[PDB]
Amino acid sequence: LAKRIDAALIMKDGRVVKGSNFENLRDSGDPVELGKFYSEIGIDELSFWDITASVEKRKTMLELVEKVAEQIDIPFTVGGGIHDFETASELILRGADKVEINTAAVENPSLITQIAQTFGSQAVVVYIAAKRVDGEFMVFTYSGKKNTGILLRDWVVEVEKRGAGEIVLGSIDRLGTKSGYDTEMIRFVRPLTTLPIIAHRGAGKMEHFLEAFLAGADAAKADSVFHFREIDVRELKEYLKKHGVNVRLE
């Protein structure tokens, strides 16, 4: 099974929030330059997540997408408060390959179908933030602030039915930790969907990526562990290939 390594970049006002430790870059906080560098060292796909204030947010995200599409030749997603079809459409047309949606999809699951009808399922990534509550995996919205009362098991099935292309499974039980991806959650979700599962939250060392792939993840996404250079991307790819994981190098 081919496996993918993804890097996520959190952005505000056109800048990478908290930057990165790559001293070789002209501007280690420029999301375009940082994303281009990642694409040259072994990242397979990029995610750009925007948290800009509402008044400049739409134009900021559109300008980001346009610049990234010109400079980078790997697929990328954009996300962060994409609430309706028109917003998703303008970002895809401006250059993004995929949009990543969460709270708006939970509140209006037909948004998944509406985007997929024009852009295909492959353009729709649903990010599912989940946490254990009273012994059950529950779906959370609004950056983890709201327990929806929807079971993870039910939402995964609905997301596929509505036409999503990929699911990013983010474990709130691992946010800020470096103890590993939530492999129990990945194993819980794996039999429920045919879609690619992207693990998110908890990665602290290269072996954690191996564990996530053994759990059934098709891709593993991380952020600060790469930006602060706790894990080197090329070392990670060499490690995974050494231990039998079908990852891409050259």
Residue numbers in the entry: 2 to 251
Paper passage:
Computational design of KE07 involved construction of a theozyme to catalyze the chemical reaction, which was then grafted into the scaffold of imidazole glycerol phosphate synthase (HisF) from Thermotoga maritima. Catalytically essential residues from the initial design include a base (Glu101) that facilitates C−H bond cleavage, an H-bond donor (Lys222) to stabilize the phenoxide intermediate, and a π-stacking residue (Trp50), which was designed to stabilize the transition state and favor substrate binding through interactions with the aromatic ring of the substrate. This initial KE07 design (Round 1; R1) catalyzes the cleavage of 5-nitrobenzisoxazole, with 103-fold rate acceleration over the noncatalyzed reaction and a turnover rate (kcat) of 0.018 s−1.
The Val12Met and Phe77Ile mutations, also in the second shell, cause changes to internal cavities that cause a slight rotation in the backbone at Trp50 that also favors the alternative configuration. To the solution sampling of these states, we used HREX-MD simulations, which are among the most comprehensive computational methods to investigate conformational sampling. These simulations also reveal that the mobility of Glu101 was reduced as a result of the hydrogen bond formed to the indole nitrogen of Trp50 in R5; this could account for the improved pre-exponential factor from R5 onwards.
